[PDB]
Amino acid sequence: ADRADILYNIRQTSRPDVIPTQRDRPVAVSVSLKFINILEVNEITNEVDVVFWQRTTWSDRTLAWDSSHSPDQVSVPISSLWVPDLAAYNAISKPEVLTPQLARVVSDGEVLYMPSIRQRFSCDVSGVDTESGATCRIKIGSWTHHSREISVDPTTENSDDSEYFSQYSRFEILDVTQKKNSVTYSCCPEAYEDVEVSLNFRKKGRS
Amino acid sequence: ADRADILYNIRQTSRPDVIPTQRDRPVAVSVSLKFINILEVNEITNEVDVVFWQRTTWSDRTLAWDSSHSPDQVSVPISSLWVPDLAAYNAISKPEVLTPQLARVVSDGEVLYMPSIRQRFSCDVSGVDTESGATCRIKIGSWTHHSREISVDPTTENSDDSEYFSQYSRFEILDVTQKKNSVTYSCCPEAYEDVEVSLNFRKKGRSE
Amino acid sequence: ADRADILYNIRQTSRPDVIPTQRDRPVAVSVSLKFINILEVNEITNEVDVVFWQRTTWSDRTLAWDSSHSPDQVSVPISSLWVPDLAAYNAISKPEVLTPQLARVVSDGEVLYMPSIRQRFSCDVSGVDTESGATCRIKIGSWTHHSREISVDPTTENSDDSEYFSQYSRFEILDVTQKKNSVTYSCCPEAYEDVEVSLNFRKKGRS
Amino acid sequence: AADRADILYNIRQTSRPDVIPTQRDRPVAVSVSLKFINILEVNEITNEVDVVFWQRTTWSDRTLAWDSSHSPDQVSVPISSLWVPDLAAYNAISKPEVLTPQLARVVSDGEVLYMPSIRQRFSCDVSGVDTESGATCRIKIGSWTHHSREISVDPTTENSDDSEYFSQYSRFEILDVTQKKNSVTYSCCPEAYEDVEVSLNFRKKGRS
Amino acid sequence: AADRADILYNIRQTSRPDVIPTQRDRPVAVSVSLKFINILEVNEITNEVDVVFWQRTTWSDRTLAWDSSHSPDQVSVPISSLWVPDLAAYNAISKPEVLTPQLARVVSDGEVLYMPSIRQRFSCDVSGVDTESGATCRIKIGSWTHHSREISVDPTTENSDDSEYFSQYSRFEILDVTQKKNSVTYSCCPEAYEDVEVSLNFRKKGRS
Ligand SMILES: CN/C(=N\[N+](=O)[O-])NCc1cnc(Cl)s1
Ligand SMILES: CN/C(=N\[N+](=O)[O-])NCc1cnc(Cl)s1
Ligand SMILES: CN/C(=N\[N+](=O)[O-])NCc1cnc(Cl)s1
Ligand SMILES: CN/C(=N\[N+](=O)[O-])NCc1cnc(Cl)s1
Numbered sequence A, C: 001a002d003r004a005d006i007l008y009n010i011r012q013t014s015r016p017d018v019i020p021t022q023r024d025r026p027v028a029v030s031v032s033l034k035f036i037n038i039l040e041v042n043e044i045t046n047e048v049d050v051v052f053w054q055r056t057t058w059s060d061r062t063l064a065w066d067s068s069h070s071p072d073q074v075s076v077p078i079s080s081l082w083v084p085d086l087a088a089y090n091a092i093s094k095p096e097v098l099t100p101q102l103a104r105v106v107s108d109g110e111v112l113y114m115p116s117i118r119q120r121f122s123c124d125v126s127g128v129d130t131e132s133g134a135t136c137r138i139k140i141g142s143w144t145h146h147s148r149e150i151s152v153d154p155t156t157e158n159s160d161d162s163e164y165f166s167q168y169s170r171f172e173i174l175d176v177t178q179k180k181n182s183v184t185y186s187c188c189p190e191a192y193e194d195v196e197v198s199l200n201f202r203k204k205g206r207s
Numbered sequence B: 001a002d003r004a005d006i007l008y009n010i011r012q013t014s015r016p017d018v019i020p021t022q023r024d025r026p027v028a029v030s031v032s033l034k035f036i037n038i039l040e041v042n043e044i045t046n047e048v049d050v051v052f053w054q055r056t057t058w059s060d061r062t063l064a065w066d067s068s069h070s071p072d073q074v075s076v077p078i079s080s081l082w083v084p085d086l087a088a089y090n091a092i093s094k095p096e097v098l099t100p101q102l103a104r105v106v107s108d109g110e111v112l113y114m115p116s117i118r119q120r121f122s123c124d125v126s127g128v129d130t131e132s133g134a135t136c137r138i139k140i141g142s143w144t145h146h147s148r149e150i151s152v153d154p155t156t157e158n159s160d161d162s163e164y165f166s167q168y169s170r171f172e173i174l175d176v177t178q179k180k181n182s183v184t185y186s187c188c189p190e191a192y193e194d195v196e197v198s199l200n201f202r203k204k205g206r207s208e
Numbered sequence D, E: 001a002a003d004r005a006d007i008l009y010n011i012r013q014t015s016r017p018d019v020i021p022t023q024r025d026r027p028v029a030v031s032v033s034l035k036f037i038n039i040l041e042v043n044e045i046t047n048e049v050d051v052v053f054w055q056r057t058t059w060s061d062r063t064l065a066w067d068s069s070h071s072p073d074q075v076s077v078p079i080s081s082l083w084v085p086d087l088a089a090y091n092a093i094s095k096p097e098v099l100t101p102q103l104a105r106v107v108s109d110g111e112v113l114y115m116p117s118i119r120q121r122f123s124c125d126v127s128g129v130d131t132e133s134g135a136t137c138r139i140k141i142g143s144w145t146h147h148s149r150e151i152s153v154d155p156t157t158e159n160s161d162d163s164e165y166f167s168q169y170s171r172f173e174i175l176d177v178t179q180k181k182n183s184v185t186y187s188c189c190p191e192a193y194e195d196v197e198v199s200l201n202f203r204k205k206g207r208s
């Protein structure tokens, strides 16, 4: 087997419009943003324009193959794959995807998709010019699928919060915490899971 | 059966360009805006930029299936279903759809589609910097289907207007009231139903 | 024959890239702008930004069906139909179509398409703050089909011109005249028919 | 008698959109003539100008020819069904906003005419715009991928008025226009690339 | 023998655009080189530049080759028919605005050449732009999803020097472009993604 065959096989088995629920359990999607830049910020309107990599991780076993004597990874367009309907609940602009819309697929079915996204949010900018900084909280979860259908978690890998953050930003990152949360709506007993990324940041220059 | 089979079936039955009209009566489409944010008001131009979750419900019986031994619900792309051709009559920009464009379909035939839309309107902004606030009126209904094909009725419930409104907005919501109406034109015989949403709001933290 | 059948047959019989020309005679397209709003205006650059419903009407007899025991009108996507190739000759922006891209098809062959269009034009803005107002003239006609192939005609539909105009606009309409015309060029004899729409308007100098 | 439908279907089945209609080995003779409709948002500091123009573009594909003895002489055809020359403005700094329907005109002798109204920004000499001598903005346009052996671009010597189709309502006026032919070559590679250099000479209307 | 239409037909039959053309299990040697055309907006406070550049991209796809001994040895081909490297600018803050026809140039041996003019905004060091020694804006471009065992990027150590196609009408000027190679790795996984780093040394002209 070879890469042509892997991609060919994916076309035959993949159903992009059908959630790949193994049996009757939810598809566990691991979500994790890595902040790259903070471009525009508004102290009055409480809005921030941000650039970030949204590391996304789920499993789809229909796409699996034997990588005994063939590659165990390929890049595949997201248009050929089911992708989770993640939305940011406090975004006030369409997510601007800056990178090639290709997911990485492993022989064992586990998918990895990490687009760099510029997007504008509505969050608490208060304190941004102080030295304890502002805390902008972003809530990201499935727009249409609930607990039983999709579950969302953070990678919970504590490390360098400003590893890939631009040194040429006007701001700097103090902390980033990523917390699981089980939001529910007033219409219906239907709990939607979301990951709450708290971005603690301040403007550079101090006195 | 499974979710794969349900969607397969739905593709075969559903006709996206065919309004699923029950014999010879209008399709009942309910509409309900839930305002999330108010971004850029301009009292001079009488223009406001708004974010809202447009909760839309209707029945397409042709989508139905037996859910005894199968899931009762699935998310389906809006391109695989018929969707009401709703437009805001006083919009001055295309609706920017922020969320994934999937609808929610139940085996009983009812569709639920609630996108988060950002849009700019022309409406009465005067009074935004006052106690009583400005009242922005947004009229929404079918662009091509008249009252015999689409009837719109606002799912009105005096519960909580700012339930999902952002606390960090410059503005605060005083009141929202959704009201059914019906527009006719001196050109033509057809009447087009609509929902007027009166958004009464003002700036937070004014002098008293 | 239910709605599905009408619509099905329309898709089977429609020829989007072929003008439904009756014999030698042209296609009688009728066009009528109904001004909804005027948003931005500049007297220095002579540039207006205008919203208007472009009521467009023509006949394609191939689509006709017997509507004695059937629906007599249906809503159809304009990507399925032939559509007159209209252009605003003094436009300076691609027309932003704000409404759903659906036309109305009648069983006798008549097609009605009335999109709401926001568009930027180049025209006389001199006046505008005065009592007389300013007359912005807008020419709309076919881009590639001349008199013999496409004819344009304003629908002389007596209506006060502010019927659908926004009361919350910063400007107001004085008078709107929709005059038929026919522009011709220096390369070729080909004469192209246009509607010359005269928008006499001014700023609401309040009191 | 062949009707328009028959003419189109012939074109579709024999026109190869992604194949240059080379006649044996000789280059396809494209003709490019810009007609200027307006000049907008000028800037002498940054050296940049929005310009609207009709880009009259003519070439020929004789495989498309038919007998118009008792049938229409021309048809309008979408450009997606045709091969269209891959012209680009070399000093453009925004992608071209095509304002008009993307229909070409095919003539029964195989001749093809495409003339869109394009609104596009350029980097060029804007110095002198508020002087009587004016500024001279040069726009180079030619095939992005096909060399002289494959595509030749010719400026149409018409000798007409330069401000013929130009908007009288612009802030600026045209003094003179000259469409010269040029042969751009690159440091890396041998094969030469033809272009038309259009020198637009324009000045700000003396409002006094 | 074979015409251009025959060459193009064969390409669409052999070319699989979503499959990296790894000969053996070597990485694909994608070579990347920017050639700067303009610098339009610069902001020293926010560290953001709006640059226009040609992105000379070159690689081998041997599943495209053909016998050109009695046929043309090159063709222009739309990139949607070819596999194209998934190159991204790591510190780009806007999508790449491709200003030119999206056609690549394929040679009979399998060599593909794609040189799009692109306008794009970057987050980089603008400090000193108005000084004599200027600013140094570093742009990092490499594959987005393929690691070093799949795509290897490399600057064509071929100058070409190097304000050659840079607009003389720009507000700024180039002092030095240098294009060295790099190999970034991450904390997630042990696989290195090659990139090219283009240091643009520029400054506002002024006078002296
Ligand atoms: C830039 N950071 C990356 N990985 N990382 O672990 O941070 N890039 C590799 C990938 C990019 N897209 C997919 Cl899918 S994997
Ligand atoms: C935020 N409110 C939601 N549901 N709710 O019932 O309130 N979201 C779930 C869905 C959103 N769109 C569709 Cl369709 S289901
Ligand atoms: C909403 N206003 C309408 N007419 N009007 O005269 O105002 N609708 C009728 C139609 C609109 N578009 C098509 Cl097609 S039929
Ligand atoms: C706007 N000027 C035109 N002709 N002219 O000669 O000036 N229009 C007619 C055509 C437009 N596109 C094609 Cl093809 S023929």
Ligand SMILES: CN/C(=N\[N+](=O)[O-])NCc1cnc(Cl)s1
Pocket: D144, D145, D186, D187, D188, D189, D193, E103, E104, E105, E113, E114, E115, E116
């Ligand atoms: C403007 N520079 C060019 N080449 N160059 O090597 O400098 N143009 C020719 C090409 C443009 N796109 C392809 Cl592919 S070949």
